[PDB]
Amino acid sequence: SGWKLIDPISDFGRMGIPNRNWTITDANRNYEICSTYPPEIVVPKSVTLGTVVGSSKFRSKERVPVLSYLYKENNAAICRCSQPLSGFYTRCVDDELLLEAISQTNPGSQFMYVVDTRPKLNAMANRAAGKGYENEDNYANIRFRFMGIENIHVMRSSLQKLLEVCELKTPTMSEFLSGLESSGWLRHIKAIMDAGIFITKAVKVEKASVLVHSSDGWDRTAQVCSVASILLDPFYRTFKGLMILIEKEWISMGHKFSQRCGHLDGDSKEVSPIFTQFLDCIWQLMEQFPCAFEFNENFLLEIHDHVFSCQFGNFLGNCQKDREDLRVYEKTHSVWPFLVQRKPDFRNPLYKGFTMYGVLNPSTVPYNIQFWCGMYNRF
Amino acid sequence: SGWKLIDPISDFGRMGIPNRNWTITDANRNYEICSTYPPEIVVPKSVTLGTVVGSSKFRSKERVPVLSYLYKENNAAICRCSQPLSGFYTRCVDDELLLEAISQTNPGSQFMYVVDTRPKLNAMANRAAGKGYENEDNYANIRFRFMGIENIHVMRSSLQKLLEVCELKTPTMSEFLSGLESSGWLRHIKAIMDAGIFITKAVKVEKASVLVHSSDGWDRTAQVCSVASILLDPFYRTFKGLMILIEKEWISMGHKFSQRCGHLDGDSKEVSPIFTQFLDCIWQLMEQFPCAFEFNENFLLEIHDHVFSCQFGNFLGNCQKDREDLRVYEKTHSVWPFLVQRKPDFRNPLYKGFTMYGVLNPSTVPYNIQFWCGMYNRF
Numbered sequence: 039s040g041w042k043l044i045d046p047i048s049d050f051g052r053m054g055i056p057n058r059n060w061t062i063t064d065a066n067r068n069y070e071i072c073s074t075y076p077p078e079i080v081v082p083k084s085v086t087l088g089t090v091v092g093s094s095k096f097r098s099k100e101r102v103p104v105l106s107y108l109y110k111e112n113n114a115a116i117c118r119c120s121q122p123l124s125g126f127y128t129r130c131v132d133d134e135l136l137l138e139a140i141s142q143t144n145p146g147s148q149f150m151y152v153v154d155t156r157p158k159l160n161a162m163a164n165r166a167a168g169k170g171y172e173n174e175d176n177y178a179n180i181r182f183r184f185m186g187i188e189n190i191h192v193m194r195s196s197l198q199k200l201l202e203v204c205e206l207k208t209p210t211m212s213e214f215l216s217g218l219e220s221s222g223w224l225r226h227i228k229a230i231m232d233a234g235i236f237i238t239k240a241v242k243v244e245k246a247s248v249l250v251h252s253s254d255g256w257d258r259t260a261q262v263c264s265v266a267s268i269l270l271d272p273f274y275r276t277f278k279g280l281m282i283l284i285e286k287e288w289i290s291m292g293h294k295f296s297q298r299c300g301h302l303d304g305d306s307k308e309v310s311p312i313f314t315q316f317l318d319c320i321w322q323l324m325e326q327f328p329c330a331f332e333f334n335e336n337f338l339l340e341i342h343d344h345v346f347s348c349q350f351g352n353f354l355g356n357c358q359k360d361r362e363d364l365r366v367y368e369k370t371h372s373v374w375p376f377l378v379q380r381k382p383d384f385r386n387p388l389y390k391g392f393t394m395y396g397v398l399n400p401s402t403v404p405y406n407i408q409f410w411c412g413m414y415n416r417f
Numbered sequence: 418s419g420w421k422l423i424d425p426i427s428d429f430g431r432m433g434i435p436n437r438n439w440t441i442t443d444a445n446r447n448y449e450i451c452s453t454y455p456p457e458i459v460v461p462k463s464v465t466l467g468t469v470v471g472s473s474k475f476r477s478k479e480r481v482p483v484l485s486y487l488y489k490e491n492n493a494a495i496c497r498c499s500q501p502l503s504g505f506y507t508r509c510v511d512d513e514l515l516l517e518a519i520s521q522t523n524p525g526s527q528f529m530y531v532v533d534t535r536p537k538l539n540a541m542a543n544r545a546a547g548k549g550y551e552n553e554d555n556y557a558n559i560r561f562r563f564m565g566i567e568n569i570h571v572m573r574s575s576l577q578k579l580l581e582v583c584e585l586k587t588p589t590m591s592e593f594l595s596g597l598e599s600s601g602w603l604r605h606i607k608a609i610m611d612a613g614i615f616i617t618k619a620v621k622v623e624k625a626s627v628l629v630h631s632s633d634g635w636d637r638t639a640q641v642c643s644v645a646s647i648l649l650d651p652f653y654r655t656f657k658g659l660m661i662l663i664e665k666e667w668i669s670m671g672h673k674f675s676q677r678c679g680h681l682d683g684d685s686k687e688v689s690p691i692f693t694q695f696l697d698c699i700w701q702l703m704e705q706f707p708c709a710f711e712f713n714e715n716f717l718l719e720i721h722d723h724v725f726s727c728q729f730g731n732f733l734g735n736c737q738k739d740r741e742d743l744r745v746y747e748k749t750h751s752v753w754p755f756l757v758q759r760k761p762d763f764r765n766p767l768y769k770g771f772t773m774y775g776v777l778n779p780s781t782v783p784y785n786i787q788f789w790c791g792m793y794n795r796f
Binding site: 204209210211212213214225387388403405409411414 | 583588589590591592593594595597598601603604607766767782783784785786787788790793
């Protein structure tokens with residue numbers, strides 16, 4: 039019952055789903071569509087199972103396009119998936135049909151964005167290894183954009199570089215700022231945010247739906263989709279809101295916490311501070327909007343702690359099927375009740391409530407993107 | 418009548434003065450000892466009038482050693498002055514004696530500190546111009562220390578570089594970071610803080626009294642003395658406290674606000690962000706101690722706003738005499754009352770009260786000395 043406190047799928051309820059446009063399939067009830075997706079997924083109503091599975095077989099690791107967020111007010115939505123398996127030549131009808139079907143849930147807009155979170159160069163590299171990205175020729179009325187966020191290896195490097203600098207024996211400012219710049223860390227934070235802001239404007243301003251993918255659709259995809267949601271919707275700026283976004287977009291959707299956070303092996307090329315960057319992105323917004331969020335800096339820092347402590351079950355393993363196999367929902371407890379106990383210590387006292395802010399328009403002029411002391415004092 | 422709300426001398430009372438070691442002399446009542454000092458001033462009890470004037474004539478601008486702050490618990494004190502007129506060889510019994518009287522108001526410590534805020538190369542250039550600095554060989558148990566804080570033309574050039582960076586058209590994170598390093602601004606605010614922390618640790622840990630001087634004793638001497646004061650005493654972290662600190666150490670002691678803040682001539686080589694740097698240092702402490710200060714970021718910024726707006730009277734003129742002779746007391750209003758009526762907007766919700774903190778112990782590792790958006794968004 040501790041576990042019934044935060045149910046990711048209720049959030050779909052909150053955006054008026056199911057409806058004329060979107061339904062919740064249990065088709066993945068036994069992980070038959072995709073082994074790293076949740077049992078329940080949301081796809082367009084107008085699509086058959088055969089089209090979903092056929093798309094699945096054209097997406098990397100079967101991570102088929104699936105809804106992440108719907109903006110009630112204008113019906114624009116954000117979807118997420120892995121990269122396509124197109125190479126230089128291959129097309130797939132069921133795939134092309136599924137993206138065609140997503141855009142049709144927003145008849146208003148004449149085109150749909152396909153946002154690729156990667157740099158063009160990396161997308162090209164993956165295309166040469168039999169993967170790649172969608173072609174504007176084979177996908178009717180799409181507008182392809184690269185976001186340019188680097189991969190997990192570059193991120194692990196960047197953080198390693200920054201901590202090495204921060205631990206220097208009595209350094210000057212010029213030494214420190216030189217090292218900060220070298221690490222690239224704030225470039226990476228700034229990139230993720232900018233990609234968030236791009237998608238936000240796509241959805242709010244242009245009223246256009248967006249399909250987001252990275253390579254595997256579970257690192258940069260989770261970051262940038264989450265950030266966009268926090269930008270669009272006040273709900274995710276609340277205790278329950280954020281608790282929910284994390285269970286939905288990170289935990290259930292199969293960000294590999296056990297591998298990324300080193301629960302079993304810390305010396306692996308699979309370790310990377312991807313969830314850290316996401317919390318950092320929320321921190322940046324809090325700094326820029328001292329009144330917009332219900333929670334304070336401490337909330338994020340405690341969440342970050344238990345992502346690593348393994349004190350709770352929420353973040354164990356690398357997907358929902360893993361967690362089900364670990365019997366985690368029966369034999370362990372959930373963070374969220376535990377953190378709800380401690381809300382007194384987590385409340386932003388400058389918070390101006392739910393109805394105050396709508397969509398946030400931060401600036402990412404670099405003097406706004408700052409080193410986060412409270413965080414790079416826990417490493 | 419609002420011109421009486423904040424009275425500087427009252428702060429001497431608060432530290433228990435007059436007493437067995439310190440008095441308020443009337444000697445400068447008609448500004449005949451020092452023209453740029455205020456009418457009342459604090460010197461040791463054991464000192465004669467003849468020694469005070471004798472010393473003043475061996476100090477640049479006649480800005481003789483006077484008391485800045487007495488740490489009651491310790492009897493260790495902080496005095497301030499201008500550089501001595503000792504050149505290469507000349508000495509002065511009167512100046513030597515007045516420094517020994519200062520140290521003999523704190524008999525517990527076998528030595529007194531003398532703190533030169535300048536880098537030694539500057540102090541040497543001043544020596545070659547017939548001024549300079551004290552020789553440990555000519556003075557009673559002094560340990561002489563350079564703080565390395567650069568001059569006003571450097572500070573001016575620095576802020577000027579920094580703003581040029583910030584208003585660059587869409588800079589990469591790298592361009593900004595490299596420009597922030599080049600401007601040197603954070604190097605300067607760190608040095609100031611480090612000077613403050615040096616003094617602070619002298620008084621608290623070693624129970625050693627400190628004489629602080631620069632060249633003219635009214636820019637760097639004010640920054641450093643003030644920062645050490647905030648670090649030692651909670652009183653200056655309250656609303657009234659800081660208004661008193663600014664009246665006492667900055668306005669009454671003759672920091673040339675009009676020349677500095679560009680009231681008269683903005684093109685002047687005399688313009689320099691000295692007070693700006695000071696508010697920055699307070700904010701840096703507020704960020705490291707979000708519960709220690711009664712006021713918030715806005716209190717500093719509004720204060721700063723008016724120092725430049727010339728809407729009230731308090732920062733007009735370059736010292737007390739200028740101020741009295743222009744009759745500003747009579748012709749405009751004080752800022753301080755005007756700010757008390759707006760305290761709702763200045764309060765720090767996380768303030769844990771007066772007795773919760775003692776001597777603050779900040780870190781000046783370059784990563785927690787940060788760029789202040791609030792401030793360089795006003796320029």
